[PDB]
Design an enzyme around this catalytic site. Structure first.
Site, PDB file in Angstrom:
ATOM      1  N   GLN A   1       0.826  -1.208   0.000  1.00  0.00           N
ATOM      2  CA  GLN A   1       0.000   0.000   0.000  1.00  0.00           C
ATOM      3  C   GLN A   1       0.862   1.261   0.000  1.00  0.00           C
ATOM      4  OE1 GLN A   1      -3.153   0.993  -0.274  1.00  0.00           O
ATOM      5  NE2 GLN A   1      -2.780   3.112   0.374  1.00  0.00           N
ATOM      6  N   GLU A   2       1.918   1.251   0.810  1.00  0.00           N
ATOM      7  CA  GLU A   2       2.794   2.403   0.932  1.00  0.00           C
ATOM      8  C   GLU A   2       3.628   2.777  -0.291  1.00  0.00           C
ATOM      9  OE1 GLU A   2       2.584   4.558   3.103  1.00  0.00           O
ATOM     10  OE2 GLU A   2       2.015   3.743   5.043  1.00  0.00           O
ATOM     11  N   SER A   3       4.314   1.794  -0.866  1.00  0.00           N
ATOM     12  CA  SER A   3       5.228   2.062  -1.980  1.00  0.00           C
ATOM     13  C   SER A   3       4.994   1.360  -3.308  1.00  0.00           C
ATOM     14  CB  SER A   3       6.634   1.682  -1.535  1.00  0.00           C
ATOM     15  OG  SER A   3       6.693   0.282  -1.291  1.00  0.00           O
TER      16      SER A   3
END
Ligand SMILES: CC(=O)N[C@H]1[C@H](O[C@H]2[C@H](O[C@H](C)C(=O)N[C@@H](C)C(=O)N[C@H](C)C(=O)O)[C@@H](NC(C)=O)[C@@H]3OC[C@H]2O3)O[C@H](CO)[C@@H](O)[C@@H]1O
Length: 618
Positions: free
Chosen positions: A477-479
């Protein structure tokens, strides 16, 4: 020679170049012409002395490298260099067509003016002018000569002031009003006072003639006032409506603005009653949805029924509202109708479709479309792919992302799926995800959720309570698996760690070897610190992934506040849906869905929530 030998020479020439050992660079440059990344070396050479480069050299390089990302950006960069030389004739010779960047465009139109093409210069100027955003400094000279020509429509001038105000660019509103054309000089001071302090809105409204312009200007300032003090704005509506003779739609917009600010826990009974009357008379879908979320976050069953029904037909099509319609029907004893909605949701992809499955005790079926058996196309054997291969070998993920973007762009869905699988097969995890996004291959789950850095996640979660699948979901989700990505605010790497968070985590856990935020770009370092902080919020909130994901994104304090608001009155799904920050709400939904996908690819049952998370009071 060989690709392997060229790789050594490539690393060596960059090392010498970084040390300005130009005698070494000049000797080595010719021998690297056959290496796929040679164009990047030429680009560095050309830009090293851009102020002295003849246009012919730049033109030749740009034409010889049509798919090289930096060659494409060099077009606009050189246009700006010619503008710096004040070579207007040369600028247009080099770039006869409108350039790519806004800054270059400002210079392109100024070049047009300088070469007797005023009418064209004005057309471009007006297009660059009509925005509330502050434009490049290069445009200042263009806007100046445009105004000096007498061809700048005063209405266009006043329009930018309106756009700037709406965008919250009060600094620009002030500068524009400070140089106000004589036509509107009478309201210049009032506008400056409004941009400086939105609390002067009633004075502004009463002292200026009411027009569409002043009404819109006042409505923006009104929202700023409501944000500082919702009651002050609530009480001001009658006077403002009277001061500007506002119609019904305009008065309702003012009501909507205040209602948005009365969604807190601290609202009085008088304020709550006024708020609900305003929302009942509203046409705003988002406002009604926020009110629905308030009912969900407080366990208000009658309120949920009331407000869900107020949603326009179109909004009722959304997965979340369909699930909550089923939830209401279930409590009403309408089993068949409710379960048909849930079964329809189960056929789709996403958070709610998975919630639906767990709600009725049925196993969720993951739809997984496979990429073609053969991934080898002309696209995987050309020069651009060869550059991508070298960039990934050197771990230059951001540079590779730009090349990959050109390669997957304007391709058929089949070709984009082959490229996704080609990247996947080579363990270019970020590129695999990037291609699925470009091709909108939402059901090609294997390429969308690759088991990236598997060994590292296993090693760094083995001594922690957070599941490996969970840490991977957060990273995904983050990167989107790019270890070199940084957000505008400075979050870094796979787990998007802020410098302050990294420092605080390293101290809290007594982690050795961390001295610079630059290390956050290293996969192992990032995973080490990231899994550590994730484990911290996980244990802090009783090993509950809803709480830990929300805390990772919005911070532990915000989560404590939200839990104090719901106060044990609601269920897991209502807690997720009622999260007041749209970013965090979407983040939690995505992470829970992704964790299920990762559990599936790891051979575990992808049930959305654990029994504890599912049954807990929120
Ligand atoms: C590098 C970075 O800025 N990371 C932040 C991350 O930003 C993401 C975010 O992705 C959202 C979820 C998205 O919908 N992206 C598009 C491209 C998409 O189609 N995603 C698919 C569903 C998929 O399969 O992944 C976007 N950012 C914003 C602000 O909307 C954007 O796209 C990719 C990245 O930039 O968001 C995190 C918060 O959710 C944040 O903590 C992190 O720093």
């Amino acid at each position: 020679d060989s690709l392997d030998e060229q790789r050594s020479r490539y690393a060596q020439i960059k090392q010498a170049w970084d040390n300005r050992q130009m005698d070494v660079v000049e000797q080595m440059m010719p021998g690297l012409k056959d290496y796929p990344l040679y164009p990047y070396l030429e680009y560095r050479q050309i830009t090293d002395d851009l102020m002295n480069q003849p246009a012919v050299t730049v033109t030749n390089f740009v034409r010889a490298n049509p798919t090289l990302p930096p060659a494409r950006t060099l077009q606009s960069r050189f246009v700006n260099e010619l503008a710096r030389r004040e070579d207007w004739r040369g600028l247009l010779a080099f770039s006869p067509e409108k350039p790519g960047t806004t800054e270059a465009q400002c210079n392109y139109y100024y070049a047009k003016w300088n070469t007797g093409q005023s009418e064209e210069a004005w057309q471009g100027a007006k297009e660059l002018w009509l925005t509330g955003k502050s434009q490049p400094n290069a445009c200042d000279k263009l806007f100046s000569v445009w105004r000096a020509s007498g061809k700048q429509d005063p209405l266009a001038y006043l329009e930018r002031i309106r756009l700037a105000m709406k965008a919250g660019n009060t600094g620009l509103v002030t500068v524009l009003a400070g140089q106000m054309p004589a036509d509107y000089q009478t309201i210049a001071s009032a506008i400056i006072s409004l941009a400086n302090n939105p609390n002067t809105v009633l004075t502004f409204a009463r002292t200026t003639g009411a027009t569409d312009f002043t009404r819109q200007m006042a409505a923006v300032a009104f929202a700023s006032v409501a944000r500082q003090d919702a009651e002050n704005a609530r009480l001001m509506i009658p006077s403002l409506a009277q001061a500007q003779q506002l119609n019904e739609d305009q008065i309702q917009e003012l009501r909507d603005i205040v209602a948005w600010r009365l969604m807190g826990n601290d609202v009085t009974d008088e304020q709550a009653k006024w708020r609900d009357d305003a929302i009942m008379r509203s046409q705003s879908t988002s406002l009604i949805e926020r009110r629905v979320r308030m009912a969900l976050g407080t366990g208000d069953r009658r309120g949920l029924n009331t407000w869900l029904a107020r949603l326009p037909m179109e909004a009722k099509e959304k997965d979340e509202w369909r699930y909550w319609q089923a939830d209401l029907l279930l409590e009403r004893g309408r089993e068949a109708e409710a379960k048909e909605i849930l079964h329809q949701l189960m056929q789709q992809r996403g958070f709610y479709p998975m919630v639906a499955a767990q709600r009725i005790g049925e196993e969720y079926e993951l739809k997984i479309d496979k990429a073609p058996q053969n991934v080898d196309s002309a696209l995987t054997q050309g020069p651009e792919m060869a550059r991508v291969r070298e960039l990934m070998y050197w771990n230059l993920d951001n540079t590779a992302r730009s090349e990959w973007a050109n390669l997957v762009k304007s391709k058929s869905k089949t070709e984009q799926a082959q490229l996704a699988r080609y990247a996947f097969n080579n363990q270019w995890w970020d590129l695999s995800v990037q291609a699925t996004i470009a091709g909108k291959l939402w059901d090609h789950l294997e390429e969308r959720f690759p088991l990236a850095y598997n060994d590292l996640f296993k090693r760094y979660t083995s001594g922690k309570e957070i599941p490996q699948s969970y840490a991977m979901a957060i990273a995904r989700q983050e990167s989107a698996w790019n270890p070199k990505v940084k957000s505008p605010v400075g979050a870094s790497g796979l787990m998007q760690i802020m410098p302050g968070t990294a420092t605080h985590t390293v101290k809290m856990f007594s982690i050795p070897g961390y001295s610079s935020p630059g290390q956050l770009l290293d996969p192992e370092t990032n995973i080490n610190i990231g899994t550590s902080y994730l484990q911290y919020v996980y244990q802090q909130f009783g090993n509950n992934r809803i709480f830990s994901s929300a805390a990772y994104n919005a911070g532990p304090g915000r989560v404590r506040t939200w839990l104090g608001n719901s106060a044990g009155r609601i269920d897991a799904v209502a807690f997720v849906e009622s999260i007041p920050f749209s970013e965090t709400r979407g983040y939690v939904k995505n992470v829970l869905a992704y964790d299920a996908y990762y559990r599936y690819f790891m051979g575990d049952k992808p049930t959305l929530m654990s029994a504890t998370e599912w049954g807990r009071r929120y």
